[PDB]
Every structure is written in C-alpha cells, then in structure tokens.
C-alpha cells in the first residue's frame, strides 16, 4: 500500500511513501502496531483519534529530538466507516531490552555488566532529556527500550502513555506496567511527579542484574507486598510523601532485605548502590536522571578506550546538547570526562 504522509520532523512537508509486508506485531484497544517495509523495515502505530482534539502522542514526539528517543519518520491519517485513525510511522529497531534479556534468561546466562552499563546510561540520559522537555513517559519497562544488537544504541519508544505533568493537575494513578509501577501510584497518588520514571528505570536495572523482575507482583496490592519484602515496610513519613491518606493505618513492620543480599554474588557494589538510590519510597529522594548518569556505576563508559564487548565503539554517550548541559550544570564536570 502507498500513501502521502507528513514528515515527522521539520516543517509540514509531504512525501509519498510506499510500504509492503504489513504484519500485526500487537493488537489492543490502545491501538494496533504493525511492522512493514518501505527498502527499510518500519513500525506503524494505528490509533483511533477524536478529530476534535490533538493526538497527545503525536504532539510529544514532534517536540522531542534526541539520539536516545525513537524517531517519528512520518505520520498520516486514515478513515473507516467521524471515525479517524492516526498512523505513526516510526524508525524500526531490531531488538528490545526485553527480548535481549529473555534470550539471556532462556540460555541461563547473565547479561554482561558492560551492556547493562551502556544500556542503562542511555535510558537515564533519555529520561533526563524528556523530563527537561516537560514529558513524563509513564511506561518505562524493558519492552519499551529499543536496542540495536550491534551498536548497542538504545532508544526509548511508545509514548502512548506519556503526559506533561503540570503542577496541581491530578493524574491517573493506575498507570505504568505493574512490575515497574512506583509505590506512590499503587497508593493511588494523583499528584505524582516524573520521578515515577526513575523508579521504573531502577526496576529495569535491578531486573538486568537479577535475571528476573525485582518486584513481581501479581496484583496491585501484591506489588506493594513484593516491594515491601525487599525495601521493608515504608515508614509513616514515607507514606506521607506518597499518599498522606495512608499515614494513620497500622501497617505490619517487615524488615528490609539487605541490598547486598538481594543480588547475586559478584554483582558490582556500585550497581547495588545505584539501585538503592533509585528505588526509594519517597519520590523526591530518588536520583535525578542526570544524577544517575553521573553515578560511579557508569565510570567505565567515561574511561578513555572503553569498547563494546563485540569490539566496536561505544555508541553516542557524551555528545550533549546545550540544553542537556543546562539541566544540572554542577554534574557537567563528571558527565563530560576530562578527555572531552
């Protein structure tokens, strides 16, 4: 099939595009996700859109431009039977962090620590950027992290849950994928911040170190239970920061599992340290995304001459825009290694 579509980036410029081998990759009322070939493979998300309002995902993507965010190549509209569909044509990336992790778990293997570092730096850098653009992703999970199998480039994708969190506007609590859902959301907070993304990113990191989700809850309440069996019962003051409607209950006091006893032997200490700095009950005690990029755990990526395990160059890690260097300038000396 062939269509005239609008360029994803730049001024409103039209381009005739032609695609074939259209196959459903995923269904659901959240939209339909196809894969097709243009001759490059591409992803197309078809979603029903109320004609009277802008598409939230489209506006966010047209506003982000970063090497660690999936590119919107084109978009076009469609009808069928006021029934309007928006079609987002996105850059196709062969793998996801989820697919890679499952290959390692199926093979009963551990992901090499260097790739954990390379991937998680890029996630944290991408979160720094989108947060600086006013966008909270709200669905950070391995299945939404695209990775190139060869270059180790990581791109965040699926902004269908994403939202600008405006101070004072209530937002939906039952958001994110459950294993990665921040505890304040499980407590039904509506005034949460973009630090829910950092909680989710901490869950990914732990998952890459463990070989399985850190918090595998089978329901909303069991998710809080899985978190508590690791972190211990939140204090009343932590509950107060999450949702003050719960400060007056008597929750049972469960001891924390020591962080160094949560992870396998030979897990790097700085990896454990970073996890504990991200996986904090109180949202404002979680590291900022840029703070996580500057963590000691990523020191290997800043060392002159560090290379990928398949002996290729590291992907772009230090080509910071002027905006990025303005986010938390006091980390700039750490973020930019001396050798520039």
């Amino acid at each position: 099939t062939t269509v005239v579509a609008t360029l994803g980036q730049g001024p409103e410029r039209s381009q005739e595009v032609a695609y074939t081998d259209i196959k459903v990759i995923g269904n659901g009322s959240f939209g339909v996700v196809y894969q097709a070939r243009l001759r490059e493979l591409v992803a197309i998300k078809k979603v029903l859109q109320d004609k009277r309002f802008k598409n939230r995902e489209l506006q966010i993507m047209r506003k982000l431009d970063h090497c660690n965010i999936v590119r919107l190549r084109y978009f076009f509209y469609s009808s069928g039977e006021d029934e309007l569909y928006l079609n987002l044509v996105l850059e196709y990336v062969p793998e996801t962090v989820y697919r890679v992790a499952r290959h390692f778990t199926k093979a009963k293997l551990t992901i090499p620590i260097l790739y954990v570092k390379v991937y998680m730096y890029q996630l944290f850098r991408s979160l720094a950027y989108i947060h600086s653009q006013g966008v909270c992703h709200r669905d950070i999970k391995p299945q939404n992290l695209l990775v190139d199998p060869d270059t180790a480039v990581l791109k965040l994708c699926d902004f269908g849950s994403a939202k600008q969190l405006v101070r004072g506007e209530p937002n939906v609590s039952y958001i994110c994928s459950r294993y990665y859902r921040a505890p304040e959301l499980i407590f039904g907070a509506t005034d949460y911040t973009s630090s829910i993304d950092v909680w989710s990113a901490g869950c990914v990191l732990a998952e890459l170190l463990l070989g399985q989700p850190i918090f595998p809850g089978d329901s909303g309440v069991d998710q809080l239970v899985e978190i508590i069996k690791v972190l211990g019962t939140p204090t009343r003051e932590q509950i107060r920061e999450m949702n003050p409607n719960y400060t007056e209950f008597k929750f049972p006091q469960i001891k924390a599992h020591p962080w160094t006893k949560v992870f396998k032997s030979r897990t790097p200490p700085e990896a454990i340290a970073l996890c504990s700095s991200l996986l904090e009950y109180t949202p404002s005690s979680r590291l900022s995304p840029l703070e996580a990029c500057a963590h000691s755990f990523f020191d290997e990526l800043r060392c002159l001459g560090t290379q990928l395990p398949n002996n290729r160059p590291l992907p772009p890690l230090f080509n910071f825009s002027a905006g990025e260097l303005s986010i938390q300038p006091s980390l700039n000396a750490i973020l930019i290694p001396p050798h520039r």
Binding site: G188, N245, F249, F251, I254
Partner: peptide
C-alpha cells in the same frame, strides 16, 4: 479505592509474610 479497604487488604497480605 477506599483507603481503609486497600490498607486492610495490604495489612492482611503483609501479616502473611
């Protein structure tokens, strides 16, 4: 959704740990 209902559920699950 009611905090008392949710908290009571949570307390019962935590007690079983």
């Amino acid at each position: 959704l009611l905090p008392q209902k949710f908290a009571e559920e949570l307390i019962h699950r935590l007690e079983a740990v």
